[PDB]
Amino acid sequence: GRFDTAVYARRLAAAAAATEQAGLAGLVITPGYDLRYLIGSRADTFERLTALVLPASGVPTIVLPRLELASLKESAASDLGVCVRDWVDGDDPYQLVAVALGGAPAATAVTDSMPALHLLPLADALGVLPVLATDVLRQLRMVKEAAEVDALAKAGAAIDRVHARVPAFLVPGRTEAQVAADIAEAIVAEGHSAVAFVIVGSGPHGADPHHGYSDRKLQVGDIVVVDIGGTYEPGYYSDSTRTYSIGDPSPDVAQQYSALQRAQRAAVDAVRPGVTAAQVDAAARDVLADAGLAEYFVHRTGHGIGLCVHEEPYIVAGNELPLVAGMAFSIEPGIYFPGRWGARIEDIVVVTENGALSVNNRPHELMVVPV
Amino acid sequence: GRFDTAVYARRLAAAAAATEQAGLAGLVITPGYDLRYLIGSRADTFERLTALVLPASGVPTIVLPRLELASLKESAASDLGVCVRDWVDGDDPYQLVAVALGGAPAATAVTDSMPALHLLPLADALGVLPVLATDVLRQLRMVKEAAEVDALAKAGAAIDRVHARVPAFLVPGRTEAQVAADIAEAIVAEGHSAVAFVIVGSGPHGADPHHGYSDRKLQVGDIVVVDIGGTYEPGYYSDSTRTYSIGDPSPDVAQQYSALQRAQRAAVDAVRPGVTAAQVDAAARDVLADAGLAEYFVHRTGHGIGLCVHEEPYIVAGNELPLVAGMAFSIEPGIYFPGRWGARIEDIVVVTENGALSVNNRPHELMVVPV
Ligand SMILES: [Zn+2]
Ligand SMILES: [Zn+2]
Ligand SMILES: [Zn+2]
Ligand SMILES: [Zn+2]
Ligand SMILES: [Zn+2]
Ligand SMILES: [Zn+2]
Ligand SMILES: [Zn+2]
Ligand SMILES: [Zn+2]
Ligand SMILES: [Zn+2]
Ligand SMILES: [Zn+2]
Ligand SMILES: [Zn+2]
Numbered sequence A, B: 001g002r003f004d005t006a007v008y009a010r011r012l013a014a015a016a017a018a019t020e021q022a023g024l025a026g027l028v029i030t031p032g033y034d035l036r037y038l039i040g041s042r043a044d045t046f047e048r049l050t051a052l053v054l055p056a057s058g059v060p061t062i063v064l065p066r067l068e069l070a071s072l073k074e075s076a077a078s079d080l081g082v083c084v085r086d087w088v089d090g091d092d093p094y095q096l097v098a099v100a101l102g103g104a105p106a107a108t109a110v111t112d113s114m115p116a117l118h119l120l121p122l123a124d125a126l127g128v129l130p131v132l133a134t135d136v137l138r139q140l141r142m143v144k145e146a147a148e149v150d151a152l153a154k155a156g157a158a159i160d161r162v163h164a165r166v167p168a169f170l171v172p173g174r175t176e177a178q179v180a181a182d183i184a185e186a187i188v189a190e191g192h193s194a195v196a197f198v199i200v201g202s203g204p205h206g207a208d209p210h211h212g213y214s215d216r217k218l219q220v221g222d223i224v225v226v227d228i229g230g231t232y233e234p235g236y237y238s239d240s241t242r243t244y245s246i247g248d249p250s251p252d253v254a255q256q257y258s259a260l261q262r263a264q265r266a267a268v269d270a271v272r273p274g275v276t277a278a279q280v281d282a283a284a285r286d287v288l289a290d291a292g293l294a295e296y297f298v299h300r301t302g303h304g305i306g307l308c309v310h311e312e313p314y315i316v317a318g319n320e321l322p323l324v325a326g327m328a329f330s331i332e333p334g335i336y337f338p339g340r341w342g343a344r345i346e347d348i349v350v351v352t353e354n355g356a357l358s359v360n361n362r363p364h365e366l367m368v369v370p371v
């Protein structure tokens, strides 16, 4: 479910140090993925405030409902002896957060997931508008530790084993939803503790990035986009797309697809410490430009992945962030032809000291499933 | 899945009028339950901004990723011809929100679910710190329309049918989790389109409000707290708790439980237009005080319910909101004895012109299941 307490003790210290280096009095983390990362808590109260208050200096405090007290034994909080301030319905828990930071006025950063419901009254209680914690917690969470790389690698190998099972699911007459049920079951069977998402976009639906699956039946000649992932304990994601053709594709489809393959490969080959996120997006986008296809490449090249399917860093135009070793993100260019077909090639890669490691290794060619 | 477009046209106009009456330039609704209520959208992009921009005056605008364009046909947005501003990865969509409101500086309110990720850059783009939309949208969403009352009533009758099936699940030796699987299946069978939550707190776990279910086996003498709900199309919740005893309880348990029953009944009897939320909480809390039990009543008396299990109004100490007809909330006092047992009696009620209608009607007595 979670890492040893020592892992969290070390994340908490590193987070406090970076908060101090950013000149803030502290961080305020309500439930979600930053909390899970910082103390291993899967708590989520919703309208009732639970928050980890991590001062730049001194002992952290957990503010939470008294009725939730037993949740402390679940995460690392109890073992580390963080201060607890439980409150009862009728209390203003925002005042407890202020006090745990030394009292208003206090300059803080908040987890980017904190809802307005809490953020706006927190701002009043603190006397200072919070800034996003993303610049602070980024330095930690986007640089994966050895054990996190390992979990992503095992999730990647597992999702690869699912993609190997996909061609036998792709039979004319079967609906996208029957394929998706077969895939969901295989996601679990191959070792993920849960299904994250299943996308099976056949024929025209492959051109539609919002599409999940439906009752459309596979036809001979369909290009089928398959984008799938699961979680691997203690909660890291796989996320890989491969495109299949039901019977031989046409020459035009084959040629444009192979430009996409070159684009994807070239973005993967550009991954090194020191190159910018925007340079990696440029590497895919330039090849597709040169083949005359850039207008059909309607999204960013990739997103970070870890405890969430989508996180820092973003491999997108305008992102000047230099890449460093241990960053994990997708490389997933695609081309989309509204009403006709689409294709996407997606790997998760991990930055190494002199390049990248792909944790997804299925063939990159368009797989031709016989009819 | 959703209401006729006319229902949303009317919610949008009423929301605009209240926004103007509050002196704001407009509302900004990112994905979640306010969006579902306002235009019937189940969209959720996450780190990419989707927002309904509802000016105090003039046509609303949807700001969303170009890659999500097809989602517009899913909700009422396309039928009502709202303006669309799609944007591409690399763009700052917060600038589009500002412009749709006439440009910075713009004073707005935001859905209480909006995450910091969007709220903090939105605040900069708008030139003015947003306030919570809860005071505006409250006037709409906490007053249920006839069709919403109907959906809650059908969900309530369905969850009652589940509670009727619960005694036969409660057999010594069976684990809480096996009971919970039986309940989850019955939730669907009785007509809910999905399970919302299943709580089976037996023996000591009944004293623990954070508890869901576990591998603890039911024992003779256990008091079992059962708190369960599902959704009913187009997405309204049931939420009802009843307490069971495995074989006759002891005289002390029986006596204290009947004080809880009186407390619950007295909060239900106090529900009328014009009484305050805090007076309704007082009605339950005073009876439990008088029996000497108030210190074991460790939470608010109830919460609003509708498209979410937890919403406005909150039936809690300090809430001065006068109740009006069509409000829907739980009445759910409980008493908790750490390490020993707990009990909770929970109904959803709807305020009527001269009182309340309960949509949950299972017996309020402690049900004694034979061993
Ligand atoms: Zn809640
Ligand atoms: Zn302390
Ligand atoms: Zn974050
Ligand atoms: Zn279709
Ligand atoms: Zn979508
Ligand atoms: Zn991806
Ligand atoms: Zn993907
Ligand atoms: Zn290859
Ligand atoms: Zn190859
Ligand atoms: Zn996302
Ligand atoms: Zn327009």
Ligand SMILES: [Zn+2]
Binding pocket: B034, B111, B112, B113, B134, B137
């Ligand atoms: Zn709301």
Ligand SMILES: [Zn+2]
Binding pocket: B205, B214, B216
């Ligand atoms: Zn236990």
Ligand SMILES: [Zn+2]
Binding pocket: A044, A045, A068, A071, B209, B210, B211
């Ligand atoms: Zn809880």
Ligand SMILES: [Zn+2]
Binding pocket: B239, B303, B330, B332, B346
């Ligand atoms: Zn409830």
Ligand SMILES: [Zn+2]
Binding pocket: B227, B228, B239, B240, B241, B346
């Ligand atoms: Zn309940």
Ligand SMILES: [Zn+2]
Binding pocket: B362, B363, B364, B365
């Ligand atoms: Zn009764």
Ligand SMILES: [Zn+2]
Binding pocket: B363, B364, B365
């Ligand atoms: Zn009775």
